[PDB]
Design a protein around this ligand. Structure first.
Ligand SMILES: Nc1ncnc2c1ncn2[C@@H]1O[C@H](COP(=O)(O)OP(=O)(O)OP(=O)(O)O)[C@@H](O)[C@H]1O
Ligand SMILES: Nc1ncnc2c1ncn2[C@@H]1O[C@H](COP(=O)(O)OP(=O)(O)OP(=O)(O)O)[C@@H](O)[C@H]1O
Ligand SMILES: Nc1ncnc2c1ncn2[C@@H]1O[C@H](COP(=O)(O)OP(=O)(O)OP(=O)(O)O)[C@@H](O)[C@H]1O
Ligand SMILES: Nc1ncnc2c1ncn2[C@@H]1O[C@H](COP(=O)(O)OP(=O)(O)OP(=O)(O)O)[C@@H](O)[C@H]1O
Ligand SMILES: Nc1ncnc2c1ncn2[C@@H]1O[C@H](COP(=O)(O)OP(=O)(O)OP(=O)(O)O)[C@@H](O)[C@H]1O
Ligand SMILES: [Mg+2]
Ligand SMILES: [Mg+2]
Ligand SMILES: [Mg+2]
Ligand SMILES: [Mg+2]
Ligand SMILES: [Mg+2]
Lengths: 343, 343, 343, 343, 343
DNA sequence: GGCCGCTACGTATCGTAGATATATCTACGC
DNA sequence: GCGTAGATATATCTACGATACGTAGCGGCC
């Protein structure tokens, strides 16, 4: 069958909810972005940053998880022979309790996340304030200053040598007090990547575009991947969105499969084409239906757990500005050639 | 009988006042908002915020308490088997005697309230400046920097994993020094809610609307629940107001039940439809009557403890703007569809 | 006799002056406002603020003292059975040297005043900086940060459970530099009151009309009590003024009682209703007479130590303004009817 | 053959990728810059700085590696006879987390990098906080103040006496707080160089022109080497770029040698004449074409890993203004003569 | 002969380069300044500061070295009889990493530099924190507060009694943040000179003029020696420069003596008449010629190792700026006579 | 005359060294 | 024979200085 297993109807609601939660769909944009990211990670070729832009609800975190899993699987056969190697390390950036992104916490959290291997790996981190304990947890005291933590993290990264160092919610790097400090933050990250040779991938919303082009050096060593949404203007994206809706409705564990392609306009209006928004909206509707033990879904039910027009209107304002800034037109190439004198 | 028990008359005045205080009425808006909130808490589906708005004397705190008690009673069977579980952690915000919102105090208050289980549960939380004592209290020294407290709170929340984290009178988060810092405050809370995977519910008045829609990501990860007041224009709200007035009249521990529905216009004038304000009014009047040991109530007694016109006028000014902001019309849908191209 | 005992004549002038000073006459406004406040603080019913409004001489301080003494008397039988309870505590706001009202000093003075019971009650207050001493005083180290003092004061307030917290001269809270600071001062007070569940009565002059109505929450959770002065328009007010004046005349410890009711116009001119102004004016005149032992009082004696016109009109400007804002007319009532739709 | 070894086609993908990566092409600009740098390092003649300006892709780091290798080779036969001497020490500047550059970390890391000889070499540097360990690595305590580290580093430099002291990514020196502090930073570097008599070479992007001629004293002891890119206005640079493209396509390990000189305009458009960027582009394209096992490179393949137009547009912006500062014209000579009176 | 020794042509390049670098030419300005400095050093007569101003290239360091060597040779006969007497002690000024000149480092460096005789002198300095070691190099337990180290330096200076204390690049004293702190620095140096009674000679660039006559006390107690460069308006210095060029071309270890007299304008343009800069230029050109084994110096060779016009323009920009400050005219005499009334 | 932007200053905070409490080894006086 | 004294190293507390941020008062513009 092309849908959910029919056996799940007999099971209680918890397994149905879980099955729908763990189910993931493949859509053209996700596949394309995944391929590009994997190709970039495999041969960075002197690139230290991968800025993965995308709206909220597009699949950035799911993409990161998929890439992480595939990298781990790929590195497993070699990990059998060679040890002290982590295939990929991922951390999520923290919004600071202030207007400035503290770096000490970032360093210590990176050290914690990177260093949770089998205890057999001993590498005697530099600086004396960082050590192991009785429970295998990294001990970092307030004794150590930020440069010391940075040195320890650099040595650890060089020793472990992960393929890529994922940083999720990278927009939080933009919490600075000074405008030039915005470039300075990325310069610090660039130096960290340069002196360890570990590829850094930044995943964030369209407010990460403040980091897009700043200093030529950073522009040279950054790869821009755009996780674009499904627009309504292009008929192909509409067809793709409808296919996603069709497979979602096929995969909804209900006694009766509802008709979702019919109200595709409503889904687009309340999701803006983001597959994640559609997925979690359908998750809410399905949870409600399972709680009510209702064989199927109604538009009303969709209207209950939809997103407010005000919510979506703010979404499209940011998405509109994000895509406008990331727009490459043939006219732009003309100025570049004209400026370069190649006209 | 559908009213107060008759045997209370023989018992003294204090227990009568206590009975009226402990008495709670059920009205359509309360039950609707309660069911919506319970459904949202049962599954967030990638949401980290619930912004429950509403006027004053509307039952937000009572709704919170009801939700907490319901969730606790739901979780008790599983608590009997699995230890180290707190179903709901509910906290109220603190208005800084100054300007900025003290995050350190928020974190330490969270640690204090969250960790009051049976002493058997020990988790030697990260950072060495937080520990138990000889009375079971949590000791937080001033030496512990705010990010350390954040890490400790994150660990505790991750282990205990409450279903929902209530932040009452959340409008106190607006006490900030920088205008843009509103979004920063909300981002800090979002980041705290991301890595812990704990649903944050922000209980607040209409002043909380300043946080209502800032950035797309916060829009995606928030649901807006509106505790609307019983308006006067819609006849059904008038019927509900009269019904709750009659219900209150029936459960007034007096020798003679006063006729209360007749003067409903006065009650609406002073309570603006908020059930809480009406309950306060009737509590004051009952206390006065029981002090005078009078058989029944009169409009006079009502006017003594009535809210004055001036203070009541300010409330409606706040309510009028709040409801206007939170009003979604069919027209607003049209611009959203027009902008997207779904016309 | 209804007047001073005749035995005071033999006693020296100091004793007579003391007898007249500690004497406190009762007037209809005094008893009315006293009963209203008693009934308001007998149960607050979700009101956290009491705003006793009154000009110079209404008798706010003496009303506070009367209320404290009454409740202290009322609580003796329970105190004999239950320890660790203070019936009522109260302080006076400090006008800060600097621009901003100092919350640290307020908190520390509140802690000092509240915590002076018999030394048996030990409650091991939070914060290491707070404890007892060799002399039984509470020592507060300057190293203690403000939020820590607030938490300690909160715990003390919760444990001691006072019936009402008096803040005399509350107009001193208005010393702020930001327009919104005016409000979040009162918000901090409200948060302190809510978190402790202790009614906070604010006795202050007509300058407190600044704090009258700010936001719906503080508009709802506050009840306004107006200590109106005896005006001249109302014949009942004039009769009460003359009765109080006659009682004052009868209660002068003088060899021969002078006729005081004749110059009622002069007295009202120089006191404009404030009973306290009349009382301390008469204290002044009686002391002056006793210095010379003059068997009586004359018009020039009153004129010698009256209130000058320059100041006297100044109170009128303030008083008529406050009475203007505190005036609720039928026009305002019908304005609420129209706006709310109950016309 | 003038092309790549034809045996590589039998080898797997990794070998071919490694061969292409390890290929270093010789082009006129690199040759001339290398010769000038060798000449200026052979004898400083009262110079302490070599400023090597180069855009992001000129081959600054590969030039540093080449000169390092050559210096080591030239020092080798006397190194067999003379010990306690390192030919060259190579370091890279660290972008600080804070606003200002951290000199303590610079000093300690300089000591770390310079001090990795065989364990036999014992000097016993000044200050008690610096020593060896059981693994032979220098351990630096956190308690050592910056001047002490500076003194120890000076002693180490005067003992080892390296020919040159490479500070890569020297752009990070410009992160300071005070405007004038640039001069102080460069003077600190000059002072470090002077006592040790060690020629420092600073490699950085066109941003490093902020340090160019900020002081006459610093202007005297600095040599400006410009690592110019290939222009398009000059036919000679165009022909050189064409020749280098021919050499690259000649040595690409593919079954069919692709034709690249046709779209020289395209290659210039996305590389601005930078050689490193072109090499990285071709490395990524080769990796892609070698994953699909394709016997050639297709245009669309170049379009896949080409830098964004926005990235290249800005790189020209900083290059164009950078070259403008570095432009020497006959007009400047005439103004010098007029100012000097030599006209 | 008036040229270089002829037998060096048979010798390898290294010997010729060494001969050229070790050869020192004598020119009128150097001789005049040298004799003035020697006369001043012979007797200070109440002057505690010898301010030697000169551009970067005038030959300040070589003049200092020659003066120190001459004083050492003069004091050899007395040193043979009298021990514990250093004739001349000279240290270098350290540019500080922070914005403040570190006086502690200056004091300890002065002590370590001055205290390097054979181990027989056991002076037993004041303060317990400073002592010898096995290797003879003293160690200063950082603990030692800076003023105690200063006092130890005072004792060392009065015991050893050097003739002059040389400080190179004394403009490094000017790195402060407070405007009036310049006077404080100079006052500290003057005090250190006073009780020690040791003439302090400061040599630095034209930016040393910031402490020229910053106060009357320092103005009187300091005499200034100007190390003027060679100008162009005056034919005398032009002829001197011509003679210097002729001597250098006669002393070049080459087979053919190049004609440097033709391009005297070019040499003056690219050296600004600084003998040191010209010497370094010729050193570079000679090294290149020896590398190419060319029996001559071709013009283009001079352009290869010349200085950028931007560098030279910055040279002359600061040279002319300081010269007008250091210009004394007869016009400045008349007002001084007029102001005193001496006119 | 009113409102907005700048900036000068207080102040919390954090780095930082170095005073010090103390543990441990060894010698010696009781 | 043994306990205690003396010396010393070491981390950790603590005092002090540097710094970035809030912020109110004051100058400028409509
Ligand atoms: N292709 C997909 N298939 C199924 N679920 C998906 C897919 N893409 C996203 N999701 C759902 O989206 C949620 C994960 O968040 P997602 O990565 O979509 O958010 P995002 O907006 O891109 O990033 P952020 O967390 O920064 O807002 C999960 O509920 C996940 O199931
Ligand atoms: N449905 C109800 N039935 C009975 N009493 C109610 C009800 N709703 C509110 N109350 C009364 O209101 C008081 C609790 O405050 P309430 O929850 O109304 O405040 P709120 O306005 O929603 O919140 P806030 O304090 O933020 O303004 C109690 O006295 C409670 O008895
Ligand atoms: N009813 C009264 N009988 C006798 N004396 C009175 C009475 N009311 C006030 N007083 C006198 O007034 C003085 C106390 O000041 P009072 O409380 O009247 O001032 P107020 O202006 O109302 O308030 P505040 O203390 O804020 O200025 C005392 O001397 C007291 O004796
Ligand atoms: N002549 C060359 N031959 C081969 N590879 C080269 C050459 N020049 C540069 N590269 C390549 O360039 C990369 C090294 O970086 P490169 O020195 O070009 O950077 P840069 O821009 O000068 O400096 P930065 O690292 O500061 O941006 C390597 O991938 C190297 O293979
Ligand atoms: N008269 C001279 N004869 C030979 N060499 C000289 C002469 N004057 C200066 N030099 C050369 O100049 C260099 C010494 O530096 P010099 O004192 O000239 O520099 P400065 O700019 O005056 O001072 P600084 O750089 O220390 O501020 C040496 O290479 C030395 O050989
Ligand atoms: Mg996501
Ligand atoms: Mg409430
Ligand atoms: Mg009073
Ligand atoms: Mg490079
Ligand atoms: Mg010199």
């Amino acid at each position: 069958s092309t849908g959910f297993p029919l056996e799940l109807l007999t099971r209680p609601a918890t397994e149905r909810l879980a099955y729908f939660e763990n189910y993931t769909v493949a859509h053209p944009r996700l596949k394309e972005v995944y391929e590009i990211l994997m190709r970039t990670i495999a041969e960075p070729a002197g690139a230290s940053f991968i800025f993965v832009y995308g709206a909220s609800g597009v699949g950035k975190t799911t993409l990161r998880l998929r890439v992480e899993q595939k990298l781990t699987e790929l590195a497993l056969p070699k990990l059998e022979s060679d040890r002290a190697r982590v295939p990929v390390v991922g951390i999520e950036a923290i919004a600071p309790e202030s207007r400035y992104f503290n770096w000490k916490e970032y360093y210590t959290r990176a050290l914690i996340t990177l260093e949770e291997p089998l205890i057999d790996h001993k590498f005697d981190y530099g600086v004396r304030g960082i050590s192991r304990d009785n429970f295998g947890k990294i001990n970092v005291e307030s004794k150590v200053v930020a440069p010391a933590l940075r040195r320890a993290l650099e040595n650890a990264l060089i020793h472990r040598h992960p393929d890529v160092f994922f940083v999720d919610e990278a927009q939080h790097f933009g919490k600075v007090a000074s405008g030039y400090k915005l470039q300075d933050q990325l310069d610090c990250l660039k130096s960290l990547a340069n002196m360890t040779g570990i590829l850094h991938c930044l995943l964030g919303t369209y407010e990460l575009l403040t980091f897009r082009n700043l200093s030529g050096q950073l522009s040279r060593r950054s790869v821009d991947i755009h996780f674009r949404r499904y627009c309504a203007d292009s008929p192909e994206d509409v067809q793709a969105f409808k296919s996603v809706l069709l497979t979602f409705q096929q995969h909804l564990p209900l006694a009766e499969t509802p008709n979702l392609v019919d109200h595709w306009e409503y889904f687009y209006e309340r999701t803006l084409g983001c597959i994640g928004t559609l997925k979690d909206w359908l998750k809410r509707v399905l949870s409600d239906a399972l709680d009510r033990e209702a064989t199927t879904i109604t538009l009303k039910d969709l209207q209950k757990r939809a997103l407010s027009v005000a919510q979506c209107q703010k979404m499209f304002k940011e998405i509109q500005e994000g895509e406008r800034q990331l727009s490459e037109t043939e006219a732009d190439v003309q100025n570049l050639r004209s400026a370069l004198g190649l006209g």
